[PDB]
Amino acid sequence: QKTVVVTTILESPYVMMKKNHEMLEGNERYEGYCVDLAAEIAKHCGFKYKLTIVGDGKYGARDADTKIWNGMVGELVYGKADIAIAPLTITLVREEVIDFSKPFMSLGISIMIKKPQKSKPGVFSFLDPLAYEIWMCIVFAYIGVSVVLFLVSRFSPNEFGIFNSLWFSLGAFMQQGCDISPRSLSGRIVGGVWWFFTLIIISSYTANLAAFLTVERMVSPIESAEDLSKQTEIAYGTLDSGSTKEFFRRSKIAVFDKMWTYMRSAEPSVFVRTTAEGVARVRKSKGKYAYLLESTMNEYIEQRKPCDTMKVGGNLDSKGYGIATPKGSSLGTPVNLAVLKLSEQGVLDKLKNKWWYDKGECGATSALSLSNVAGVFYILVGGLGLAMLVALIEFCYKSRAEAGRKALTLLSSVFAVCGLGLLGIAVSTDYWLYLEEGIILPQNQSTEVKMSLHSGLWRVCFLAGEERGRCFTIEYVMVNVLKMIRSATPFPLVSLFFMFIGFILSNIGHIRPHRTILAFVSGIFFILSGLSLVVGLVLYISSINDEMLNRTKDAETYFNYKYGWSFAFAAISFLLTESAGVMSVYLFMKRYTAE
Amino acid sequence: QKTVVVTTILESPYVMMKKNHEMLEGNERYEGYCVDLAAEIAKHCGFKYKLTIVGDGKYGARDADTKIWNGMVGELVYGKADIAIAPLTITLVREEVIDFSKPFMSLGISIMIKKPQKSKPGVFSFLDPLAYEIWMCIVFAYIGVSVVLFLVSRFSPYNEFGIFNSLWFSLGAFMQQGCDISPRSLSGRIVGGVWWFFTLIIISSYTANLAAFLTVERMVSPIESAEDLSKQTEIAYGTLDSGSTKEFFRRSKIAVFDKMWTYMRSAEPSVFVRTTAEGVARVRKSKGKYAYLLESTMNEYIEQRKPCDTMKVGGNLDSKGYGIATPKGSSLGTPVNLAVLKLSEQGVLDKLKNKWWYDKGECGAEKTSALSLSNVAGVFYILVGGLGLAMLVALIEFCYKSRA
Amino acid sequence: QKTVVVTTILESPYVMMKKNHEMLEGNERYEGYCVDLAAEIAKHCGFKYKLTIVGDGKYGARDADTKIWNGMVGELVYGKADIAIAPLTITLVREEVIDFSKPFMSLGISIMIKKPQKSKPGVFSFLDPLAYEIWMCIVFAYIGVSVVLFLVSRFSPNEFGIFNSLWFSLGAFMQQGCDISPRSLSGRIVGGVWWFFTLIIISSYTANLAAFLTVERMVSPIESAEDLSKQTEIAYGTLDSGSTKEFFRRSKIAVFDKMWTYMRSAEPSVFVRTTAEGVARVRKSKGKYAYLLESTMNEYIEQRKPCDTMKVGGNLDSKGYGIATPKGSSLGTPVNLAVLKLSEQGVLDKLKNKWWYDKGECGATSALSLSNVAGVFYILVGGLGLAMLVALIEFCYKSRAEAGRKALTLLSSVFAVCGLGLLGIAVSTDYWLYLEEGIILPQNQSTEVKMSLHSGLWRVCFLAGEERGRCFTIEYVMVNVLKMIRSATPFPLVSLFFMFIGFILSNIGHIRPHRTILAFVSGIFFILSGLSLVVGLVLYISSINDEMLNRTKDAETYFNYKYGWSFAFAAISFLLTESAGVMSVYLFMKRYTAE
Amino acid sequence: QKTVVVTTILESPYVMMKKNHEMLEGNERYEGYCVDLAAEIAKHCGFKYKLTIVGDGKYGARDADTKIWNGMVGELVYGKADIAIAPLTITLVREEVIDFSKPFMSLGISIMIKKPQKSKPGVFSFLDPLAYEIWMCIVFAYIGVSVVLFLVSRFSPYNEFGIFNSLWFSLGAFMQQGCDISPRSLSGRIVGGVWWFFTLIIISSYTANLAAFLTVERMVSPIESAEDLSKQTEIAYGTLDSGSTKEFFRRSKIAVFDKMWTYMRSAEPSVFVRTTAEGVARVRKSKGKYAYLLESTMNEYIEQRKPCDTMKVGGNLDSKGYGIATPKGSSLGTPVNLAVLKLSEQGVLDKLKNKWWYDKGECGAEKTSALSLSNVAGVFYILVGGLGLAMLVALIEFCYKSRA
Ligand code: NA
């Protein structure tokens, strides 16, 4: 008997060169699925085979100008090339001229998506419902409400120093019952409206955290092309010379009618060439792209070097492979028995598990975890760590009691003139709110910057985007506007009015310390500046967030906004006045009650 | 054969010039609805056509100085055209000189407004989950337990629950976590408890409704008809300044559109638009305070454009139709007339509208926005307005304390 | 000139008889849209008309066996019957043989659904998240935890009588801070685990109420047939001889492909005949049915006697009406001008508003309302009303102090022997849980009853469904089972063990009142029976709700379950023992401390 | 012409007898997939067919005593049939005597389990929103603040915060609303506060997650492959007792299905089903503890039946195919073979499967269930188990109190 000439193709893992090639000869240079399958069929049939490799590169098709065939179907029709144990898809136009055996493998068009890519929660992730503008104004709040209870209970009739009134503050905001209670009509109103502050913020934090966790459950990963059909944020993709595209056009099923419709009319080109590109467009387009393989390919890609892509769903259609006997040869019935005999003993299921899975280098809670609430354990430990430090402080302060007024004047004076400074500096030095925007250039994740600002209150000015050194002023301007100075002008200007009263009557109490009521009314007008700082900065940011929601989203266009060093200086100026507003009023108590 | 001269005019999506309009032939450079329609009419009737975009540039109207038709009607009557497969609107003065054909598309005057996007919060927008009748029935019951806890604790010991205290312990209860002036009576056992159960169910109804308020974002349009747009005065009207739309409101006598005309009669921020595409941007810029009135073919197309910014609301105010015209006496007049119906019966005219308006278009067919300081804004105002009101009454207190 | 013969049809509101007919003559017997339109056209054209009414009944069609026409199109072809001002739809098969004018009215296939039918919230609607099994076991809880604090603080070392411990109970469950606190290691554990009870129930009530209000917003009313296409709980309906059905078959639009698919293969028959039936199938099939009219009909039905149906969506297709001139008559061009002249002046828009709307007898908050939370105002008022009643009680009890032990023995003894009774009665008398089930017969809202039970614990027995008088027993049974006695047997049996100790040592304290510690340990074993009653009834219902969730829904099949008089007797037996468990222990305190 | 005798067998949805099976003709009384398939094969090839439901009633197999084919293969070979448009499965022993045709439907052995319906709660099911690592890190930090509040308040006054109290005030804090043994030190200002902020964020994470736990009901299947069904022992295997499915697991040598065969070898509650429709009810009755193994055509059909109670999970274990058979040498063998492919290329075979399995079927393609006492069940058990533990230690307390 002669040597039957097998004609496979260099496609992995079907036929690929052995690593020790250019050192071997003939049919013991190849390895793969079809090399093991050729060895199986030959034992059953009676062969003594000898593999070659397909001439041009191709599987088989009919050139519509000359009606010649090309490739494996080309070689076996035209006199050359016997039995064709190879990934040759059973179509109608091939089996008119050649004989296919029964399918040794059942493929189909399937969906490739990148691996669901877990998105590990941050340390301070619990403070995601309330934004960081809200968390910093709460710190301004329970400091400030403590100072008012420092005032209004030792103002006149008693147990509400800043030591005790921050305890009211840290007490009531964290919803636990405060031990003591005020006893004056004005003392209750502070405890009255602060207990309304906590009941809204906690009911806004819980309700928005239930808005995060519900929508996160409400989304769903792709598990079918029916699921892909509704979706428009994950774009499809097909090879554009071949049977994957050919399926969607002439299909009449209503889902594939909608799927081709999107692919036909979209931008940019989703009709990829050269499948290695299509695999790449899945990987560097995270959760935005979905390429459509043939099922025996994307099960191979999945069990291969880094396991980045994954098959989801079921076979959209059904097809097969087949050994391709020439047209009427005597190797057409014994091969057709030697496929069905291997597909029952389990050899065709063993050789798939071998090359796809076993020679593949890869692998095979509806509840909050510790990583979600992680910062509150670190605030707890970071809190208790601060507590043991202050346990040293009271032990040393009592030890000095075992074994000054001028310092109290020293604290109040210096904290005042820095509070006079850092507000007046900040309103003068134009380094408040930093607006930033631009549009996107795709495929590069661009850096469009063109526009910016560095605007304060009065001297609003611009830096890039024609670069405009002579920018604008409060004198009438001519499209963006700036509602910062438009509404929140008097709220720092009345703050300066209370604060100018503050340092002068402090100095009146300084130059002649026997004056008592002067330092008293000095302190009263310190906190009324600091309360104007609160309604200043709140109405400040609220005017910005109203300008934020006026965006009319514009998905491509991006934005950015950051606070400047002057916004920090007025935030620091809140601390300097208020913590002097306690020391000025406490200085009255040490002075006048001694008198 | 005869090479029928088909006239059209350049408006989207009826005839749009393809990007190869400098490197292709006449019948292959134009795309659109009328391009797909002229292929279907020629397929059923049977002729050869070459698209002949109008020389003047208008649809058609009489000039009552020289009595000469202009535009596409002008090419039909005088001789330079043979069919007019285009968006000619069937009117009386056009009907006297040419022959239309049994409308292939039914349009009407409609309402164009800006998209209902997410809006600005108020300074009392945290009172949105619980309605206004519940907030007042709490306060009227806050005074209710206040007068009970006084009349209980004054009549029973025969007095740590006067006007001063009984108003307070109810406030200390509903604004949560309690207060240390606990009642002491078996009535006060109840007076404590049954107000305290009223604390639980309101706050659990405030939290749960606000969670549903933030999960399913379900926005609505301000106006949804000409009726609701008639009674309002906030959102401004708008119409073209010389056309069939402005003429429609003038002579109408059903007294609803006459009300809409009496607004636009005075109307002095100049609501009338010149050159419609200006009025498209006028809706986009004027913050949903402006409502332009278009034909319902342009409203369904501009809605399907980038930037997605406008939406049609309501039913068609009137009904007018398009029509494949033919000259006053021709051989095409009857076979086209049965061809326009036969496309409509099979669903071709319903598919070609679906393709160009809805399929070949933008805007397609949950982002978990965190809360802003503008959402909870007035709570800071009530807080500082509480703290400021404390220092006033303390200054009142210090007055009569030192005086007495 | 002659008298042109108009041929309309008795269809409302187009042509219908005037109320004063059989008293008038000719063309002044009719009224409607087409009677006003005939008067309009005649003025423009030049007529002197005379209405008749269509011969057989019909509009016009071609009988496919004999090719004769029938009706209005029948009469105007065959020599009779001039101008045809009537609801004659412009189709292709009519205009081949007759001339239609331009459409005077633009109809379309539209959706009819019943009015959204507001579903007014109940008085006690706030207690819908937690079911009434949970609310009654809470009442068992804060009664019981009060009795344990009645015990464990006057057990040994002080301020926790039932007067004060219900105050702990009513205090802590309603989340407000309790004034006093226990001081003993066992006293804190009661306050410890009860403060864990409230934190789960409140967090289960708030979280489930947010499950109701979100899904209620998440549903959406029908506003398009695209919205109808996804839905499967509202079934469609079409007339079955006519153009409404004819549209869905030969349509190729993907939505109408899916809409016909459902209608073609469903059960029962949704292809209604005789439109008045189809309107009726909308009305007595509340939010389950949707019939598909032609747009000029369901805008008439909507503005008509009781306004029960409503048009939603837009026109699925587009069509028209038309005056139908014969084939080549001289009344074909002046009518074609007299329609377009009326459709510009607004007369065809005036006559629609007249007959549809003006001669129609009909009309033209994303927030909780008071009706939702209504019972808590009634609990508040009903609470304060009870308070003023007890204000009389303390005033009279102090007035008797101004101006008995045997009663305390009398309270404890009688409440014990009724507690011995009503538990022993209930476990004996088989009238516990009432199961009920059956399947549904549609179109009648059936009363299937066949099966039931009246089962207690031991004597489980059956009443209907072969009626089975000899039912079953605890001796082995042979499909439903009964896990009541399977798990919750010892929890009342250990309760009898504590309770048998209870009344005997009570009677030992009765026959010789100088015995002190006997009545003490009498009381200890009263509440341990009542605590076994708690874990009895909880594990009871929890075993039922596990059997409830084993249902595997079966949408047609219904179910019902009610508690019996024996379940109430053991619930009453909880009160009788516990409220004697306070009076027995308080009797020790009055006795031994006096000694 | 020739009146081709087409054989089939009565199984759904291949050939089902229509309700007019006593008042119609042969070719109009049967409906199904093979009925629609035999119309398509006759349309492309060209002949006349009359359906000839098999006399014996089986598919086909050798009887190795008399060597006579039975069933549909028996009618083909011996002469009583001409084509076999039916669900014959292509096997080797059938291939030697007749000629199949290039499968029109690709099936495989699959896994049949009960639907994952809503399940029973546990007696500790209220610990489901917060995971098990969070509940333990609370208790380990509950002891953490306990040892801090002692070491602060013992070292500072140089003692109302011993073992007795410092364990208590942390419990009084996290189990909400506070306790009246308030700390007194600037450390105790912190020790109060930073534990109190830990109260807020956990309970707001418990409430918000439980609200998401009840809103979106998202159930999962226990097993979702043969791999996950291999490693378990809880859910029982199941296969037919004499067929190609049982024979498949026996001779398989890939060692995963060999593990599945070693279970069914011992298997003594008799897992093997006689007459498959019994095993359909065995999955329905045995509470999702039984998993039957079917061909993937029956699993996709019985899933689309009333009562909707079973679902297929996982991929096909093997791959076998159907086939329109033809006798050993015929004139129909080649034109049918190209007709089966030509239907598949056009999408006819994909549509006819879609029609009979998925369209002409039940089970279609949020009910707001209130909580039950079984949901919050163990909280009553911790409560009474707390109250019972109180009376024990009190009895311990009374012992050494009167003794000392
Ligand atoms: Na809460």
Author numbering:
A (entry chain C), C (entry chain A): 392 to 548, 569 to 775, 784 to 822, 833 to 907, 919 to 1035
B (entry chain D), D (entry chain B): 392 to 549, 569 to 775, 782 to 820
Paste lines from the article.
Synaptic complexes of α-amino-3-hydroxy-5-methyl-4-isoxazolepropionic acid (AMPA) receptors (AMPARs) with auxiliary subunits mediate most excitatory neurotransmission and can be targeted to treat neuropsychiatric and neurological disorders, including epilepsy. Here we present cryogenic-electron microscopy structures of rat GluA2 AMPAR complexes with inhibitory mouse γ5 and potentiating human cornichon-2 (CNIH2) auxiliary subunits. The core of each complex is a Y-shaped tetrameric AMPAR with a three-layer domain organization. Auxiliary subunits are membrane proteins that associate with and regulate AMPAR trafficking, cellular localization, gating kinetics and pharmacology.
We also investigated whether ZK affected the closed-state conformations of the GluA2–γ5 and GluA2–γ5–CNIH2 complexes by solving structures in the apo state. We found that the ZK-bound and apo-state structures were indistinguishable with nearly identical conformations of the individual LBDs and ion channel, suggesting that both structures represent the same closed state. ZK-bound structures are used as references for further analysis as they produced higher quality structures. Expression of endogenous CNIH2 appears to be weaker than expression of the engineered GluA2–γ5 fusion construct, as evidenced by the presence of GluA2–γ5 complexes in all collected cryo-EM datasets.
